[PDB]
Amino acid sequence: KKQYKVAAVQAAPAFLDLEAGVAKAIGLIAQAAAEGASLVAFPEAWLPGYPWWIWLDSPAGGMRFVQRNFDNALEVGSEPFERLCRAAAQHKIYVVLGFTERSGGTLYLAQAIIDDCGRVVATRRKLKPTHVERSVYGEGDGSDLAVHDTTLGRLGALCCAEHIQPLSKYAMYAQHEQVHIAAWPSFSVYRGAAFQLSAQANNAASQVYALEGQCFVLAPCATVSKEMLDELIDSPAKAELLLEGGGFAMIYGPDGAPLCTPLAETEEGILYADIDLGVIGVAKAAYDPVGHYSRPDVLRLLVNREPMTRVHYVQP
Amino acid sequence: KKQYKVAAVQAAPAFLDLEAGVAKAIGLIAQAAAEGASLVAFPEAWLPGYPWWIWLDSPAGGMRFVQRNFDNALEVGSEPFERLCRAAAQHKIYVVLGFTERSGGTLYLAQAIIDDCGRVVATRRKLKPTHVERSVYGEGDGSDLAVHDTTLGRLGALCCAEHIQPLSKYAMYAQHEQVHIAAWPSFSVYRGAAFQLSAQANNAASQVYALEGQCFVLAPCATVSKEMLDELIDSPAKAELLLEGGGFAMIYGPDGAPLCTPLAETEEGILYADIDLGVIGVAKAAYDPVGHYSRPDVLRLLVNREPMTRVHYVQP
Amino acid sequence: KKQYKVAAVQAAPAFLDLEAGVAKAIGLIAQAAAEGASLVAFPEAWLPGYPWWIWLDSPAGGMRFVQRNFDNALEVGSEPFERLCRAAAQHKIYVVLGFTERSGGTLYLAQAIIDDCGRVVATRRKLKPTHVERSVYGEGDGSDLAVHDTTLGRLGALCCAEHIQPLSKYAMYAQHEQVHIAAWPSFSVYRGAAFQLSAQANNAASQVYALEGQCFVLAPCATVSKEMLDELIDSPAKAELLLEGGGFAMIYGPDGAPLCTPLAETEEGILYADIDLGVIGVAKAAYDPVGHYSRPDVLRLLVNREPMTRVHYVQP
Amino acid sequence: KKQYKVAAVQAAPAFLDLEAGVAKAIGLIAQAAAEGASLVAFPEAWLPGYPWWIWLDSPAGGMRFVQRNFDNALEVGSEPFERLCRAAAQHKIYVVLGFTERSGGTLYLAQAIIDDCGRVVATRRKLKPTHVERSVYGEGDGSDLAVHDTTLGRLGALCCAEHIQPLSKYAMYAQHEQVHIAAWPSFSVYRGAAFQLSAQANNAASQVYALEGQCFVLAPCATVSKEMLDELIDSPAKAELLLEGGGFAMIYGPDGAPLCTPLAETEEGILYADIDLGVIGVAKAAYDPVGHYSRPDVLRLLVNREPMTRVHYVQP
């Protein structure tokens, strides 16, 4: 399909209840196809919602959320995952979820591209979580540096810090990507105290990904809502550590131009844009980091593509 | 079922009489269920009793017990075993036996998990007997490194020195275990003369198994009795080598904390603890040796799960 | 040399001053050598001090310590490092440091074994920081699971949560290690409230390493102090999260028995024990997880010993 | 029945008459049962007699015995076999015959275990005749390596140099055999001139079968007699080749100890031993080639148990 509409979600998660998260994702999946989108993309960790206590508290102050986050993690192929999987067929739309996965006992910061036929194209995990997220989540492999053939073309995804990581994004450029989902949390954490968590920094990370890879970058970004702070702030010394709003979702074209009509910082919504894969031919006239711009006489990528495992079982 | 009470036996075996052992086991299986335990765990070798002569004399001094150990061995699916299988249905309690098995004429140091529907989930043999237990018992294999799905969750068992073998417990962690039966004998042997047989060594081995796996360790433990010393002690030179008591049964949470009430070293009883498979999520926030707290780029286990057979029959 | 005295330090670091930390290190290198110990072992991150703010606050509360921890991090072959190296040579004693390494923009949770003639036997990075330590530290490789031939036998080191890692300690056991430094931070963080961080959990893990490995384990342990808390606590919401004391250094024999005479929890000092590498043959008559207590037909370790570089320059 | 008397025959055959052979076998079956033996075992080829001309003559000097050996071969389920089958029932004794079977054109060196109720437990052909016996007999099958449950326990049979075949007797041990009939010819052939045909060699091969298998080896044996030599020695160049006597019948316990009272080399009789199947558990403490003493990770037996038909009939 050579041209289509795409949706980036700018919405507050149903923070630490999986089922209300799933029900709101179903309503946004429906709403994206009702406005005519062929793809919808969700924010980082959005089922059951991003683990905000890690930025607000010591590990001890997090412990009231740890059991809840683990008991509300979305396992791939669970009944709350099939509710999202069928909803992608029931609305004939590609869904890029962002979620907390669990496997046995470890949480992973995960994403899943779901087909028009309401089945996984591929699930995914973040290779390296960001510094305090490493206390919640485990790690992905080079098998999570994957760009897939879909009816929408060469479709791939990464989340927050994986846009900062140069070899991690070059591994995605190496697969001749056309459309990208850059999943982000809310940029209301540490407002004006630490620039690396700011919308200014992380919209530049996404804009530069669109310009370096020459692909359309959906940048869905969560928002922190009024009632979510009443669960999550216990004192006035934590109030300026996480604000209401933080929604700075964006969509960028293959030359770093923003394609989205704006939303306010506190505004829940979905951004929509028009995607023509033939514009990538013009955008690649300037730059192509794995074609005409590359010097394989100077720099190459060495990449372990294989999925890793803790145990090998001997077969007779 | 995620919240339930569990029982660890601290009881003396009816030493070297299987019909008295099975009768006492069915009494303790009833007594655990009468106190509302959904699982009961028994000590290592408890039917017909742990072979204490190997710690007390030469093979020539042990010969008065070798036909008695063999003739009171508990063959799996023999009528004395089906009496214990029916007792798990008759009281709607998971039974985790520890016993001497026999097959042909090799004895094995064995265990069996039995459903509350009164059927085996798995019988199971120790992979390697401890240095002088090798003079009595044969080896298991990788088919005995199994964690089983049960109504009570991912349930597994190992016995004594298998808690001191790191690859053998990595194989159990790789199966995402939730509750564990760490079966032990009476720690009254070689008191002060050898620390590897002590309460303090093997309670640390059970506490660390819980802390490493993030699973609830039931550690049932036998105890030695006056009328068992009358069978098993003949002289003051042997009387220093094995004391009355040695009952140090324990139960541990997935954070490593002891959940049990105390029992005196000489006291027969059953320990009880309230399990919640929901707590495993909090324990796994700190460590998970097969998940976030692992290095599959640096370390992996190879395991041969397949049951070994001495003879293969060609089938036409 | 098969028989010798050994030291485990129990001391508060000169918290976030490397030049006071090194002066105090050299003062304890002297106190150990003055008591006649051939080996002195230091706690985890003891130069310049363990990053306790990770346990007491959010990253935004931690920010005031981050630049100071980086500036007081100890680089390998730095002038403060050569000072420690010369102090081992000056006193004819093996020194096992625990320090924050700095190497590029990344800190590592490191250790160094210094020879009695003052050179590194090894400089060594923790393979995986514990869940919130990952917010401060990078990772080692299988280059850092290494045991060394020395004047003191086969000598090795790991720290805190690396004893809660069955493959990571089997990788050490497979190298036929005789003496081990199990370096720990203070055990006064989250007293009662998180058992995994307690003395009972981590004295068990150190004792079970001595008992699984049949190697003498020196477990040096930090302590927290009045004038360290006066910089690190500011409110009752932090006050019970890290108590004064927390010193539970121990020394264990290859059968797991505690060889150290006690100290108070609040007390600084050096623990000592008389070591005899002949006694390993007695303990290894019972268990040897890489010898007679091992089943390579069923279980093996796959291990990658190669150090991991980020760039591979094309050699001309 | 776990404790019982058993009988090994030491008797000269009624050489080359099947009718006097069956009359003498019934005379011995009666004499064994009158003594309270629950089993009697007969020598190799005892009906109608072992083919001694193969050891004394060329095939041309043998011709006068071939038609007689063929005429007096025992057809299984024929009238003279039924005459023995009835004599087992009549006396309530297990009979282990050793005979020349005939089937169609071909002779087999054969055995039959006959029940207390006088019916065949099994009829059994030697897998490989020894040396010049291959000029008389055909081969058996993997169906002839059979150990049977009986009122007497796990009962099996092999004849002469099948106790010299290590895989063949591993196939018998793998069935957890408890009582064994090692049927032999008589050890008066080539006295001093060949040791492999001797009493010392083949009594050791039987004694080692017991010691290896941990089972009671009844070793019945023929004896040569004056009236047999007067049919079979015709010249001086044979007078030293086959002597009178050669009866070295034995019975061995599962520890290898001889249980029989000594007969003379040249005396007819029946050896009696008091068997106790409980004793096999003491013998299996030390050795068990198929259990605790095996290594099925290093060695296995592949066995084809299917009997070898020469012709297959297509069925519509």
Next chain:
Amino acid sequence: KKQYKVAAVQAAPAFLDLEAGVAKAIGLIAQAAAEGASLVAFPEAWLPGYPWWIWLDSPAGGMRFVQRNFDNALEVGSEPFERLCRAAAQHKIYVVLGFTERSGGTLYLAQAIIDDCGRVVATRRKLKPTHVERSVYGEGDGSDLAVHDTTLGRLGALCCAEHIQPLSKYAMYAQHEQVHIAAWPSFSVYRGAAFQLSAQANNAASQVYALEGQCFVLAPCATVSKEMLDELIDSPAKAELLLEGGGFAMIYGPDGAPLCTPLAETEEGILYADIDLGVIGVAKAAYDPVGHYSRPDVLRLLVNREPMTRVHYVQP
């Protein structure tokens, strides 16, 4: 070389001293080489001495010998091994040692064939120690079932209860072995009271190995002596369990016939026999378990020869 003299040692070890034991070996190597023997075979565990305390007491009574046995166990390729290695070259004799090997933390019951030119043809560990020997030793693997071409024909070794293991000796026969070393410890343990440990059981096991295999079996055998019992008996309850003497060394032809002139039970000596590898063609007329007497359509051996490492180090 096809005709040669061979020597089987019958001597007491210098019990629990490797330096006195290697001197006594270097003397008996020289004494055999002076008589014209081209091969000398030594007993089982003869350096530093077979571990008789396992047969005489509990583990707790054995603890006084465990460090002495570990500290006098012979590392392969260490100076006291190279002393024996040089003594083989120095006298132009093949030496088949039997010794307690120590490799890392574990003892092994071991044998080594040293060449005429003073270098190892093989070094070799027992596949499975006998039932209470397992309280001292680890297991070998399939690389210890090896037969070697030499100046002396196809040469091989097994020790004591490996002659009792039908697949373990079919693995040897399958390699077409011509000369065998059957190393034994002294047969004075449990005189009368356990036949499995007796001279009669194990002289028959060696005879039957020679008779089954058609190879010359040298069966050297230790002896116990007054000076060994003074260290090892403290009382009459042990005094009756291990007598002085037990030397029942033998040498057998490929027909099973004893080639040795007898010694007395307590006598030290060396047995000598004229070996002729041409005679194996005559003895293989009767029997050949891997040739004309085999049935590979009914029975085959599966064997895993690969050496069993506990760790696999990943190659770059």
Next chain:
Amino acid sequence: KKQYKVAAVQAAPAFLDLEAGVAKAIGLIAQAAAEGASLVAFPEAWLPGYPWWIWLDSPAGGMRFVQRNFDNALEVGSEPFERLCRAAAQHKIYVVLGFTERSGGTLYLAQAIIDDCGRVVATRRKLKPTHVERSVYGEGDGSDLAVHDTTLGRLGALCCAEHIQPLSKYAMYAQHEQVHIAAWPSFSVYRGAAFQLSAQANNAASQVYALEGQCFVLAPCATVSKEMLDELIDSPAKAELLLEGGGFAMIYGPDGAPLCTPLAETEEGILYADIDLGVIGVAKAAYDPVGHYSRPDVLRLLVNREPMTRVHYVQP
């Protein structure tokens, strides 16, 4: 090559001297090539000679030849075999040797077809020795029923009473054989006293192979010389059991007609025949056992072509 001369040896072996026998084979190989024969065929067992003592003596009278048969058995790819292999090249003739193979411990009644290029097409063991030959030799298997493409067409070999085995020669016909080597021993044994060993019986069996198969049958035949009898006769009671001569070599057409010039019985020589593989199409007009004259709706052969091994080695 469709037309050529062929040679069948009628000659006495150099009885029991392999070096003298290979000199005589190389002489006869040259004498056939000088006559322009493109193939030469040798009798059964002809290197070193047929084991005639088995038809003349008991095993005890045969003992003087067993070592002399075994030590003069021809190993394939040993030097005296290479000597015959080079003689096939040196003269540009196909050589079909018949010999006693030795492989390990066992003799085989064997054949080897060698190219004009002086290399083995195949070496080949008899599937079943004839009744007393089974006291000398082992069995081949289905890999020994092969027919080979050569320069000379579909070439195959069997020996003596394998022409008396209907399935064994159907297995050859099924491969569309064109020239056959039917190797025999001498026909001077049991003259008049056993017709199965006669010239008439086995000339008929050779003639019927040609008639049944529609292939040219070279029947080379040994003959018995005076100086062979002088070693092999001693008593007068053998003087008529094996006579001088017994050379009844023949060569037969695919219609069964004799192509050879008649040698006398007692005469050494080489028979020569003009072979034309075109004539086979006229003989196959009448009969074809595997083609137009077969009924594969009524009758089929099942055949296991695969070579039999006693031991299988597990490869990692």
